Amino acid sequence: MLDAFAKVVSQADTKGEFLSSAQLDALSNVVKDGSKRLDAVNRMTSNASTIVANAARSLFEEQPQLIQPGGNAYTNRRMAACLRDMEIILRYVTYATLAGDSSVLDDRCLNGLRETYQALGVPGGSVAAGVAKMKDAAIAIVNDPNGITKGDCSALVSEIASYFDRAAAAVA
Amino acid sequence: MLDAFAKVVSQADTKGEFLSSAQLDALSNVVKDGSKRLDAVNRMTSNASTIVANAARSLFEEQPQLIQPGGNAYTNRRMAACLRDMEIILRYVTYATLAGDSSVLDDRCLNGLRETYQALGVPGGSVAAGVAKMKDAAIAIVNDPNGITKGDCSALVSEIASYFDRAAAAVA
Amino acid sequence: MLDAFAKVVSQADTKGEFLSSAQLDALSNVVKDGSKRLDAVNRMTSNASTIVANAARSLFEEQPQLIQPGGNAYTNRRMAACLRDMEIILRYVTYATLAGDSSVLDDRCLNGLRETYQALGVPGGSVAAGVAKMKDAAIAIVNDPNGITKGDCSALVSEIASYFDRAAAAVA
Amino acid sequence: MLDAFAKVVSQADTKGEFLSSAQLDALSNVVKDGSKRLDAVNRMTSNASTIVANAARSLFEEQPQLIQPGGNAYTNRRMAACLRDMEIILRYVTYATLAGDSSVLDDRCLNGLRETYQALGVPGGSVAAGVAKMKDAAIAIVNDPNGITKGDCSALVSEIASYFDRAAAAVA
Amino acid sequence: MKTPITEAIAAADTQGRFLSNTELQAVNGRFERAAASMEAARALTNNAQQLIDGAANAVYQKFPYTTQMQGANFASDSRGKSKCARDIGYYLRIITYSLVAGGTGPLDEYLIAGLDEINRTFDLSPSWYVEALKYIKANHGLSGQAANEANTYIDYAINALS
Amino acid sequence: MKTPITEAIAAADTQGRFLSNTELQAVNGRFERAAASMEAARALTNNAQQLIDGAANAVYQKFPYTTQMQGANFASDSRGKSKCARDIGYYLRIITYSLVAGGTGPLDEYLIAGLDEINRTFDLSPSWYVEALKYIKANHGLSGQAANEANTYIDYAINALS
Amino acid sequence: MKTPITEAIAAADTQGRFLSNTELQAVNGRFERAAASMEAARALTNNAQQLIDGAANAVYQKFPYTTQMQGANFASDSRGKSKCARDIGYYLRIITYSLVAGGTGPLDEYLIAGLDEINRTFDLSPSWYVEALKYIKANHGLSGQAANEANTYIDYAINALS
Amino acid sequence: MKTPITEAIAAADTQGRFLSNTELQAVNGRFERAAASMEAARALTNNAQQLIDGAANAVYQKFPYTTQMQGANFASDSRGKSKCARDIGYYLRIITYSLVAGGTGPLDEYLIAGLDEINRTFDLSPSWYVEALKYIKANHGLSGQAANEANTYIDYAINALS
Ligand SMILES: *[C@@H](C)[C@H]1/C(=C/c2[nH]c(/C=C3N=C(/C=C4\NC(=O)C(CC)=C4C)C(C)=C\3CCC(=O)O)c(CCC(=O)O)c2C)NC(=O)[C@@H]1C
Ligand SMILES: *[C@@H](C)[C@H]1/C(=C/c2[nH]c(/C=C3N=C(/C=C4\NC(=O)C(CC)=C4C)C(C)=C\3CCC(=O)O)c(CCC(=O)O)c2C)NC(=O)[C@@H]1C
Ligand SMILES: *[C@@H](C)[C@H]1/C(=C/c2[nH]c(/C=C3N=C(/C=C4\NC(=O)C(CC)=C4C)C(C)=C\3CCC(=O)O)c(CCC(=O)O)c2C)NC(=O)[C@@H]1C
Ligand SMILES: *[C@@H](C)[C@H]1/C(=C/c2[nH]c(/C=C3N=C(/C=C4\NC(=O)C(CC)=C4C)C(C)=C\3CCC(=O)O)c(CCC(=O)O)c2C)NC(=O)[C@@H]1C
Ligand SMILES: *[C@@H](C)[C@H]1/C(=C/c2[nH]c(/C=C3N=C(/C=C4\NC(=O)C(CC)=C4C)C(C)=C\3CCC(=O)O)c(CCC(=O)O)c2C)NC(=O)[C@@H]1C
Ligand SMILES: *[C@@H](C)[C@H]1/C(=C/c2[nH]c(/C=C3N=C(/C=C4\NC(=O)C(CC)=C4C)C(C)=C\3CCC(=O)O)c(CCC(=O)O)c2C)NC(=O)[C@@H]1C
Ligand SMILES: *[C@H](C)[C@H]1/C(=C/c2[nH]c(/C=C3N=C(/C=C4\NC(=O)C(CC)=C4C)C(C)=C\3CCC(=O)O)c(CCC(=O)O)c2C)NC(=O)[C@@H]1C
Ligand SMILES: *[C@H](C)[C@H]1/C(=C/c2[nH]c(/C=C3N=C(/C=C4\NC(=O)C(CC)=C4C)C(C)=C\3CCC(=O)O)c(CCC(=O)O)c2C)NC(=O)[C@@H]1C
Ligand SMILES: CCC1=C(C)/C(=C/C2=NC(=C\c3[nH]c(/C=C4\NC(=O)[C@H](C)[C@H]4CC)c(C)c3CCC(=O)O)/C(CCC(=O)O)=C2C)NC1=O
Ligand SMILES: CCC1=C(C)/C(=C/C2=NC(=C\c3[nH]c(/C=C4\NC(=O)[C@H](C)[C@H]4CC)c(C)c3CCC(=O)O)/C(CCC(=O)O)=C2C)NC1=O
Ligand SMILES: CCC1=C(C)/C(=C/C2=NC(=C\c3[nH]c(/C=C4\NC(=O)[C@H](C)[C@H]4CC)c(C)c3CCC(=O)O)/C(CCC(=O)O)=C2C)NC1=O
Ligand SMILES: CCC1=C(C)/C(=C/C2=NC(=C\c3[nH]c(/C=C4\NC(=O)[C@H](C)[C@H]4CC)c(C)c3CCC(=O)O)/C(CCC(=O)O)=C2C)NC1=O
């Protein structure tokens, strides 16, 4: 897999170039925001249960046929499997956030996943909706100004939202 | 596999319903006829040899070409195999009778059996005739009023006849 | 292993004679009290955790160095191991109670247990004390006249206590 | 294996009490000097070949029969084996230095080493001398005040020397 | 599905033989106890709504904070109380399933599997449901062996949460 | 030995667990059938000598050559009559063992094992003992489920010879 | 034992090599976080008794039946109150162990292992201790990364009970 | 690519779990050292041509014969000196790669692998490049921890040639 530094270094090696001041400054910004990035990762993992819970609640309100008899999340087995998928996608999003690059999310999670869902009979659009609602809950937890040194985390927040939207577009 | 209680419970679970008074009363009737059901199973197993014998006798009278030279039950090997098949089908019928549901009979015995016989060159129609004659002998043994507390076993008898007819229709 | 019927049948086969009317009467009394025996086994298994808890509470009250630093049941590891031991011994006692014979308890649980405990440094005397307290709690729960039909269970209680004392004497 | 924190926590768990303010103060001083400790480990590992070379030069100067025909370090095989031994012992000393505890050095390297050397015919006294000379070279390199921030590393140097003397005493 | 009857039949089938006298004795025991089993199932199904609402109220009284604290996992509004009654109904329904089938199969497959992850994810304290089950156990109104059957399966539900 | 109770206990001990409600139901089936089993055992033991002698005479009436032909394996003289009575006594004794134990264990262990080679070596026709057991079945004086149990294990002995 | 430093050393020793710069960076991360870890340990140890008593009273206020119902597993009398205070003390003591060690090692080893069977046997509801740890988290008086570390390991204890 | 961050993530993924507090501490150590790492990388990239030409000249002075002897592997003409400056630039560029990534991954994959065969085939003495690296190490002008980072990766390059 790659992190941000590894992606820049691989692209540089392919061209046989030293890093340009653009790339140097970008990676220096990553290094200086490292503490906020660790804060985002820690806040997402420490509240993974609540993120999954809020997303699933909003989804099941929006699509109640999911949790009624005949629904695709009705029995205990299907419900637990659905929550497992939610936490899996969230875990790979946290991986991508720590890495600063979506390589691990695509290669180890998103690839072939739409085909897997369409073979299992799981509504990919509903999974994508749940992923978006996970995005909303996770951004709400990340930007919560309580108990943290005040600052601007809008760049990290947009990066995390991009990872979530990439996850959602891979199954819809 | 399923028994009667398990079939009703699975159908209830699929709909997310409590059992209706219909299902409760049906299963209570099964429970109260349990002793006669055990009597039917015990009488069929304890006289399995005589049931197979009477059925095969009637069949071979009806179709004597079966036990003449060139017949499909002529040599000792073929004859023993034919009796083995008779006892196999009877054993799975007894299973279904104890269970109060034909699931074990279909899944573990009847499925793919017509194809097996047509690949082996065994006359499926003759097997079905022998199965019907087994049904007659077994009902005669079940309804025999001697040595048993007198009562009505007509419901169990129709159930057992249905299992036998299901077995016969799977090879004809 | 042996149950009561099996022990009597083995002793009668080794002598080559029919069962005397005495042995027939004893085994018929076992059959008559079979429902009481099932009650004892059911109450002891479905209250197993409560029995173990009461015994352990008493044992730690009178031997408090067991749950104090340096005690053989202080840490979470050794505490859980002691509770596992007591639940194991109670389980084998319920086995013997269902069988109406101590052979399973002797052969599968007690034989070689004192050697195990002294090789481990587990004090066998306190294990025997805990077993006796398990006996007291179990007999209290079995003799509880609420929720059950009034009747004499003194013989059954004495048999269960004999099993408990056999267990306590095998490690004391 | 243990580090300083782990050793203190094990000794406090075996007594069942909180850490006294003395132990808290000692471990907090370890944390404050952690950067000095990393400096010592880094300097000892990145100068390992120089440390081994200085020690070996001194050892062969004062015991020249070691590198003369018939000496236990004469041929290329035995010379390379002696250098491997010294690099191994220095590596385990750096392990103990990072851990702030000698348990790894005792258990994984020193335990049984004198028996190995006397079974091999390797003179343990000269091995201990070489270890002491490694100590001198390593402490010289660690205490070098150039290229680093001025500060007191006497406690760390004494701890490292204690590890070196523990190693030398295990084969002497 | 795992039932005593299906287990007897599977044991007979593995050895390719007819049902022995021992297996017939076992199935007879199942049938004999099935009277109490069906009595308890019919009782728990008729008194369904009464027992569900009583158990919910028992949990609310025993744990008052579940009717006061704000939060989606609590029952401080109508949505929470509807969800809680629905959960208790799920538990009771599957317990009746087990009573009907004669074994823990329905409880093992339809309820217990995945239950811990459901409770951890949505922050539903298992002790709430333990208390609900304790109320249902103390207030079914059954007597004798039907009571004993209902109690064994309610207790099996309790042990899964513990 | 192989009894229903020992089999249930062994199943529970293999999984290192307490006894389940299914197993307690099966043991209750054994206990409920044990009343008829013990009545049949008591009857067959009390009328043991009458049944043995009647069965020997039934064998003689059905296969008269056994009383006529000379040769050690026949009952032409008193020694043969006594050996045959002893044999039928062994059969009945072990059938009562099985009724007591509640399973085919004693019959599988004490009688049927090696029976084929015994009968082949001493030229004893199994149909003799089949007829003896048929007489015993027709003349034990039991009615109902006690008779059903006695006939279950007697037919089990009959099929071991066929 | 399982500390970050011991894990780095074991990784280096498995490959029979000196410590790498990656491993030294990781150990430096441990050392930089250890300042907050040690501040949190010191605070929780100094205010140990106040925190234990406050957590016990929070449990009582939240679950009042624990002070009212008779039975050995409750805190209706002085013995129960003292047992509960001792338990919360064990929890906090081991949490400080983990803060000192810099990992979940002590919590995995000294508390969580066997905790489930302990609580099942003596009928102690895990939600009690969850609430106690929530109080401790809300009342340790730490600010910043020391509070973050304390809450990390307290939530680790909370999830072991859920 | 192997980086400390990717190694942390791969360790988390192998066990199918979220990132632990220990892995977060390790990645924090990487981030903390990354300030010095990026400082050294920026310095070595700005002073690229100066350091390359200075190191080439250092090799030429230390080994005068490389500017005198005829032969394609020596630098007695313009082609050789261009090739030598290009090689030293390759070395320095990959060292900056490692500094940026935070580990020896880029050096292991982009430079060291196959380096011995390249040097043996074209008769390029590794000691030439050792001297070039020693000059770069003695003349980057960095101070403190950025200097220490640059030095560790230059030394790692030196050990590959030794
Ligand atoms: C954006 C999510 C919110 C935010 C972020 C923010 N945090 C800090 C300061 C610090 N964050 C940390 C975090 C960690 N260090 C570690 O080792 C680990 C893993 C174990 C973590 C999670 C630290 C140590 C600091 C410095 C001390 C402090 O508490 O200040 C800042 C300010 C400093 C900086 O940005 O570099 C910021 C901005 N603040 C918000 O308002 C966002 C909602
Ligand atoms: C229908 C086949 C015929 C019939 C059935 C019938 N039987 C009974 C009464 C009883 N049957 C049993 C049978 C068993 N109990 C066991 O444990 C086992 C397996 C080891 C068996 C096979 C028992 C115990 C009884 C009760 C005692 C008795 O002999 O009565 C009845 C009457 C009671 C009822 O139906 O519940 C009936 C009707 N009678 C017929 O006439 C049919 C030909
Ligand atoms: C409380 C009762 C006392 C005590 C108990 C204690 N026991 C052990 C460790 C072991 N216990 C057993 C016993 C059995 N294993 C079996 O399979 C069976 C029956 C089939 C039995 C009876 C064994 C084998 C061990 C050693 C292996 C293991 O732990 O599984 C311990 C742990 C001792 C230790 O960790 O060093 C303890 C503490 N402790 C007390 O204080 C009570 C007197
Ligand atoms: C001494 C322990 C106490 C006592 C025992 C007692 N039990 C019964 C009667 C019954 N017990 C049961 C329980 C079961 N039957 C089964 O098949 C199973 C396995 C699932 C169980 C757990 C049953 C069904 C009965 C019969 C129905 C009834 O309610 O009686 C009695 C009654 C006397 C008898 O032997 O029939 C007694 C006395 N009763 C006490 O008061 C003792 C404290
Ligand atoms: C110089 C220090 C002295 C000396 C050294 C010497 N050592 C050996 C051979 C061996 N050295 C070891 C030591 C270790 N192996 C390990 O794994 C560890 C720590 C985990 C240690 C400390 C061993 C096991 C051997 C034998 C097997 C092997 O060679 O790998 C030799 C070679 C002896 C021979 O070839 O006969 C030598 C020469 N020689 C001197 O003169 C110095 C006093
Ligand atoms: C005694 C050995 C000599 C001594 C030690 C000393 N070191 C420092 C300060 C620092 N040392 C480092 C080195 C590292 N930090 C890491 O994370 C890693 C792993 C990659 C390493 C190798 C760092 C970063 C610092 C802080 C920055 C700085 O330049 O100070 C000091 C300063 C005092 C302190 O503890 O902070 C000292 C005294 N200095 C000497 O003069 C002794 C000879
Ligand atoms: C009542 C005891 C307490 C309580 C109730 C409560 N439950 C929920 C939400 C959910 N409950 C479940 C449980 C199950 N669904 C199944 O299929 C099965 C197996 C049969 C079980 C056990 C689930 C999955 C959810 C979430 C999804 C859904 O709504 O179905 C809530 C709502 C929490 C939320 O975030 O939506 C509540 C309030 N809370 C209390 O305070 C009562 C004491
Ligand atoms: C300068 C230190 C001394 C020296 C330089 C010199 N080098 C070459 C030719 C080659 N150098 C390389 C090295 C690499 N190519 C790669 O891709 C990598 C990995 C990043 C390395 C390390 C190679 C492959 C060649 C041959 C093919 C090519 O030209 O690229 C030469 C020319 C030798 C020749 O025969 O062409 C020279 C002169 N010689 C000196 O005297 C300097 C002291
Ligand atoms: C590491 C990468 C990885 C992924 C991504 C993954 C997903 C995944 N989810 C599955 C099932 C499932 N996934 C769901 C989820 C859903 N049902 C709904 O109604 C919702 C829309 C949604 C929850 C938000 C369900 C219900 C199943 C079970 C399907 C079934 O049993 O019929 C399955 C196959 C069956 C199973 O394992 O249970 C896979 C492989 N497994 C992996 O290893
Ligand atoms: C558990 C489910 C199961 C079934 C159902 C089963 C049936 C079965 N019967 C077979 C043969 C046979 N079946 C028969 C039976 C018949 N011939 C006649 O004339 C009659 C119509 C009829 C007797 C009523 C014969 C003769 C064979 C041997 C065919 C041959 O040797 O040519 C064979 C393959 C060859 C062999 O095994 O001997 C199978 C698989 N085996 C199983 O395991
Ligand atoms: C429980 C296991 C067991 C069995 C089954 C058993 C049977 C048995 N019956 C025997 C003899 C005999 N059994 C008979 C009985 C018969 N001949 C007739 O004509 C009658 C019709 C028929 C009676 C049904 C006779 C006549 C002998 C003596 C044959 C001889 O001595 O060679 C013998 C030869 C050894 C001896 O004399 O004891 C054996 C082993 N012994 C055992 O330990
Ligand atoms: C560190 C590993 C470890 C743990 C976790 C531990 C817990 C523990 N708490 C116990 C008792 C107890 N714990 C409590 C506490 C509670 N009851 C209430 O109502 C309160 C709300 C609640 C406090 C949160 C009580 C009352 C008892 C006594 C129960 C009894 O004696 O049966 C017991 C039974 C043995 C004894 O008395 O010591 C254990 C093993 N012991 C250990 O070595």
PDB file of N, CA and C in Angstrom, chain A residues 124-140:
ATOM      1  N   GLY A 124     -26.802  -2.266  -2.982  1.00  0.00           N
ATOM      2  CA  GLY A 124     -25.628  -1.409  -2.961  1.00  0.00           C
ATOM      3  C   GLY A 124     -25.955   0.052  -2.723  1.00  0.00           C
ATOM      4  N   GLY A 125     -27.075   0.527  -3.271  1.00  0.00           N
ATOM      5  CA  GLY A 125     -27.476   1.904  -3.027  1.00  0.00           C
ATOM      6  C   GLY A 125     -27.739   2.181  -1.560  1.00  0.00           C
ATOM      7  N   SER A 126     -28.352   1.220  -0.864  1.00  0.00           N
ATOM      8  CA  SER A 126     -28.597   1.388   0.564  1.00  0.00           C
ATOM      9  C   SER A 126     -27.290   1.392   1.349  1.00  0.00           C
ATOM     10  N   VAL A 127     -26.338   0.545   0.949  1.00  0.00           N
ATOM     11  CA  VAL A 127     -25.018   0.563   1.573  1.00  0.00           C
ATOM     12  C   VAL A 127     -24.355   1.917   1.367  1.00  0.00           C
ATOM     13  N   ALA A 128     -24.490   2.483   0.166  1.00  0.00           N
ATOM     14  CA  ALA A 128     -23.906   3.793  -0.105  1.00  0.00           C
ATOM     15  C   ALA A 128     -24.554   4.876   0.747  1.00  0.00           C
ATOM     16  N   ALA A 129     -25.876   4.807   0.915  1.00  0.00           N
ATOM     17  CA  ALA A 129     -26.565   5.764   1.777  1.00  0.00           C
ATOM     18  C   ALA A 129     -26.069   5.656   3.214  1.00  0.00           C
ATOM     19  N   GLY A 130     -25.944   4.424   3.714  1.00  0.00           N
ATOM     20  CA  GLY A 130     -25.402   4.226   5.046  1.00  0.00           C
ATOM     21  C   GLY A 130     -23.983   4.737   5.183  1.00  0.00           C
ATOM     22  N   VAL A 131     -23.178   4.597   4.128  1.00  0.00           N
ATOM     23  CA  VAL A 131     -21.813   5.113   4.155  1.00  0.00           C
ATOM     24  C   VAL A 131     -21.817   6.635   4.240  1.00  0.00           C
ATOM     25  N   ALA A 132     -22.710   7.287   3.493  1.00  0.00           N
ATOM     26  CA  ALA A 132     -22.812   8.743   3.578  1.00  0.00           C
ATOM     27  C   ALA A 132     -23.241   9.187   4.974  1.00  0.00           C
ATOM     28  N   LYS A 133     -24.170   8.454   5.584  1.00  0.00           N
ATOM     29  CA  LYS A 133     -24.609   8.823   6.927  1.00  0.00           C
ATOM     30  C   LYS A 133     -23.508   8.580   7.956  1.00  0.00           C
ATOM     31  N   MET A 134     -22.696   7.538   7.746  1.00  0.00           N
ATOM     32  CA  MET A 134     -21.470   7.373   8.522  1.00  0.00           C
ATOM     33  C   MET A 134     -20.552   8.577   8.358  1.00  0.00           C
ATOM     34  N   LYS A 135     -20.418   9.078   7.127  1.00  0.00           N
ATOM     35  CA  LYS A 135     -19.602  10.264   6.887  1.00  0.00           C
ATOM     36  C   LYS A 135     -20.084  11.435   7.729  1.00  0.00           C
ATOM     37  N   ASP A 136     -21.398  11.676   7.718  1.00  0.00           N
ATOM     38  CA  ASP A 136     -21.954  12.791   8.486  1.00  0.00           C
ATOM     39  C   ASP A 136     -21.669  12.632   9.977  1.00  0.00           C
ATOM     40  N   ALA A 137     -21.945  11.443  10.528  1.00  0.00           N
ATOM     41  CA  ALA A 137     -21.701  11.215  11.952  1.00  0.00           C
ATOM     42  C   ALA A 137     -20.222  11.368  12.302  1.00  0.00           C
ATOM     43  N   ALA A 138     -19.339  10.867  11.436  1.00  0.00           N
ATOM     44  CA  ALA A 138     -17.912  10.913  11.721  1.00  0.00           C
ATOM     45  C   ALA A 138     -17.376  12.337  11.649  1.00  0.00           C
ATOM     46  N   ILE A 139     -17.853  13.131  10.687  1.00  0.00           N
ATOM     47  CA  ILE A 139     -17.440  14.529  10.627  1.00  0.00           C
ATOM     48  C   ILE A 139     -17.951  15.284  11.845  1.00  0.00           C
ATOM     49  N   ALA A 140     -19.185  14.996  12.272  1.00  0.00           N
ATOM     50  CA  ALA A 140     -19.705  15.619  13.485  1.00  0.00           C
ATOM     51  C   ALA A 140     -18.824  15.299  14.687  1.00  0.00           C
TER      52      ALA A 140
END
